[PDB]
Design a protein around this ligand. Structure first.
Ligand SMILES: Cc1c(-c2c([C@H](OC(C)(C)C)C(=O)O)n(C)c(=O)c3ccccc23)cc(F)c2c1CCCO2
Ligand SMILES: Cc1c(-c2c([C@H](OC(C)(C)C)C(=O)O)n(C)c(=O)c3ccccc23)cc(F)c2c1CCCO2
Ligand SMILES: Cc1c(-c2c([C@H](OC(C)(C)C)C(=O)O)n(C)c(=O)c3ccccc23)cc(F)c2c1CCCO2
Ligand SMILES: Cc1c(-c2c([C@H](OC(C)(C)C)C(=O)O)n(C)c(=O)c3ccccc23)cc(F)c2c1CCCO2
Lengths: 213, 209, 209, 213
């Protein structure tokens, strides 16, 4: 979702147009210099972009190169799918800030391109709050990574359907999902009510025969 | 040791020349394709490479790509210090890479396109898998330095305790923990914990500029 | 080396026991008189002593005064590290001190009073003189660290120049000076200066936390 | 003068009264703990105080111990002579600040006295403007040291009286002091006018026969 999204921009310098690859929350940015900006050139970056990390969706306000098929297509191989005021505000500014950064080392660099990357190195590296945006991406990603596997775990759990005794005497009530399994232990919710029960008490059914696995 | 360590190796390939990044624990790669090959040309990408991953050092099969001044020039901006069967594995990776490119080669007119795709495959390739990558590792590292710092802080402080029932006062000892009722510490071989009245812990000392 | 270095030595004297500070280049002393002698008691004054002069290390004739925990305790708050004919000169100083006290002894009922006076005499005693003291030395030191820092900064930076008329680019070289028209640098054995277009100087690199 | 002056105060803690020795410009402060405050005790500090550095004059708003002879007397052996709103404002505050500092490490120290010195160590040591007050004293002193010797040099120069030819033909005018001597070189001011002249042109007279030296 929002962790997946990255913001992409192109601005013109010395005629030559810069390639900008902002990360929406982490702010890690990858930018690249192409002798000429083209939808063609745009794609080459994207492949690497997906390669550094997965993006569900990427944003550009207008489509001059994105609309171009090679770009739309590239998005499909990645499966990245082309596209909050506060989030909105940061991007133009994000583009703006690097230039300011860029100017400082321009005298520092023979080649403007050589300079821009340096400009970017610092931006990821520069920082009492935060460890710098670049550091943030690794984390944001990390938390998500756990999440996804966990979600998957959750999904796995969701399928199975519970059988419960409750008191040893009572008539049965419709089956519920199982939150957790311990030996002699099960956790489920009949409707909204949560109860834990012993193994001999409850049998746990596999939800899917015929699964392709 | 391995974290923050990346390996780049010369690639011989049909047509244009490209070089591929390796982070050894992830095996992660961020290769780029260059029409012209010089360690220098290599540098521009490398400069891009460090930002995505701070890399402490790199070990090179060939001095010559390393020898070019500009290449060292990159090392310094980075503060990267060149790291003067595992290489065969990196090689194997390169090999794997080559194979991968081939599988998808038909799909793309341009070799470069293929290579990135190839990069993609190694990347996010299920297998506990390489694809998930070292991000978890980097995070653990991000977490790691602070702990190393806090412990280093605990290490920095010197705490002076008196064995209970002993007028003689015990030498400063590395403190394991601080508690308002009691703080835990080891002098060297023997570790003891005492109540606040029994011992005192200096606040700061000046060193390190 | 000598600046920031002070020597304290055990004093045997009539009545009460006092110990005297020495800064070797100044020969400056800030002795105090203690009814009870322990390295510990010594410490309270020492703690006072460091503030007036940061002292890096002290060399002691006797381990025992040094051995007491509290004494080491003082060393650490200071970050002072005990420094495990010149000693005879310090001794001579002590001797001189003793004599000095005697000259004025008659004037004062209390031995302590005399000693301070004695301290005063060594102090501000004309002779290029000790009395003017190391203050000039301390100042030069205060000035010194910043220069060592600025040079260290110049040392930190690496500058890359191309010999004029040479496509081959010269390895980074320690830069002696920066000029908008030209900057001065030495690679190692040979030192050359070039115009800004001929060479480039990286802005910063990251190291030292 | 003002470099010479130091500010001295006594405040009461735990009944016991602290001894405070502020430096007017440098702010370096020496303070000492006396089991009991007395004019007697006060003196002991002063001797050391003059000993660390010379003070022309020292300040206390009221005289309970200073008025005491032993204190006045002590001042004479040192030759220190007992006694600007901004300068005035800093002292009470100076006394106030250390206490705040003192409290922090009080838990740090078994003995309050042990603590106060530490409190002071920091105050001299703690610092983008300045190198910290303590560092300042060494400097302020240093500049003064040069000054005094220089003044002395000046005084030496002042005594001598100049004889000048000016043009080789002209009648002479009253003698002036000599600012500087170079071989074949002399600098003097006849009244307010400054002129430089050759040796053969001008003779330089020693100002004092009968000097005790
Ligand atoms: C085919 C192709 C193209 C594509 C190409 C390719 O070369 C590029 C340098 C443009 C990446 C290629 O090697 O095939 N080419 C050459 C095209 O002519 C083209 C035309 C229309 C749409 C896509 C491409 C563009 C892509 F970004 C892309 C792909 C496939 C994988 C996902 O990304
Ligand atoms: C300047 C420079 C150079 C360098 C350059 C630069 O342009 C490249 C296209 C080679 C990156 C530059 O913009 O100055 N150039 C042009 C040189 O001529 C050069 C010569 C000797 C050593 C380094 C460079 C090479 C580097 F690897 C490098 C840097 C700066 C950052 C750290 O790494
Ligand atoms: C605490 C302490 C001690 C210390 C003390 C202290 O009181 C003295 C009167 C001895 C200075 C204190 O106030 O705590 N005390 C009381 C101890 O009992 C003690 C025992 C072992 C080691 C040091 C001290 C000794 C020191 F040299 C010292 C310090 C702190 C600053 C650095 O130097
Ligand atoms: C005599 C004396 C006294 C003095 C003393 C002396 O002992 C002190 C501990 C008080 C310093 C001394 O050793 O003589 N004594 C003991 C007195 O009784 C006394 C009485 C009146 C005035 C001064 C002193 C006080 C001083 F601060 C002092 C001097 C002389 C040198 C300058 O300073």
């Amino acid at each position: 979702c929002s962790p997946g999204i990255w913001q992409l921009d192109c601005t013109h310098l010395e005629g030559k147009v810069i390639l900008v690859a902002v990360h929406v929350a982490s702010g890690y940015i990858e930018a690249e210099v192409i002798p000429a900006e083209t939808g063609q050139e745009t794609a080459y970056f994207l492949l690497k972009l997906a390669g550094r990390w997965p993006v569900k969706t990427v944003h550009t306000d207008n489509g001059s190169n994105f609309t171009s098929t090679t770009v739309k297509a590239a998005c499909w191989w990645a499966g990245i799918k082309q596209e909050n005021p506060q989030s909105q505000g940061v991007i133009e500014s994000m583009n703006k800030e690097l230039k300011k950064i860029i100017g400082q080392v321009r005298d520092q660099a023979e080649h403007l391109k050589t300079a821009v990357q340096m400009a970017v190195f610092i931006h990821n590296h520069k920082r009492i709050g935060g460890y710098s945006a670049g550091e943030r991406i690794v984390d944001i990603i990390a938390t998500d990574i756990q999440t996804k596997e966990l979600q998957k775990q959750i999904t796995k759990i969701q399928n199975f359907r519970v059988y419960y005794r409750d008191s040893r005497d009572p008539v049965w009530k419709g089956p519920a999902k199982l939150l957790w399994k311990g030996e002699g232990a099960v956790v489920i919710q009949d409707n909204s009510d949560i109860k834990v029960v012993p193994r001999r008490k409850a049998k746990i059914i596999r939800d899917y025969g015929k699964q392709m696995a």
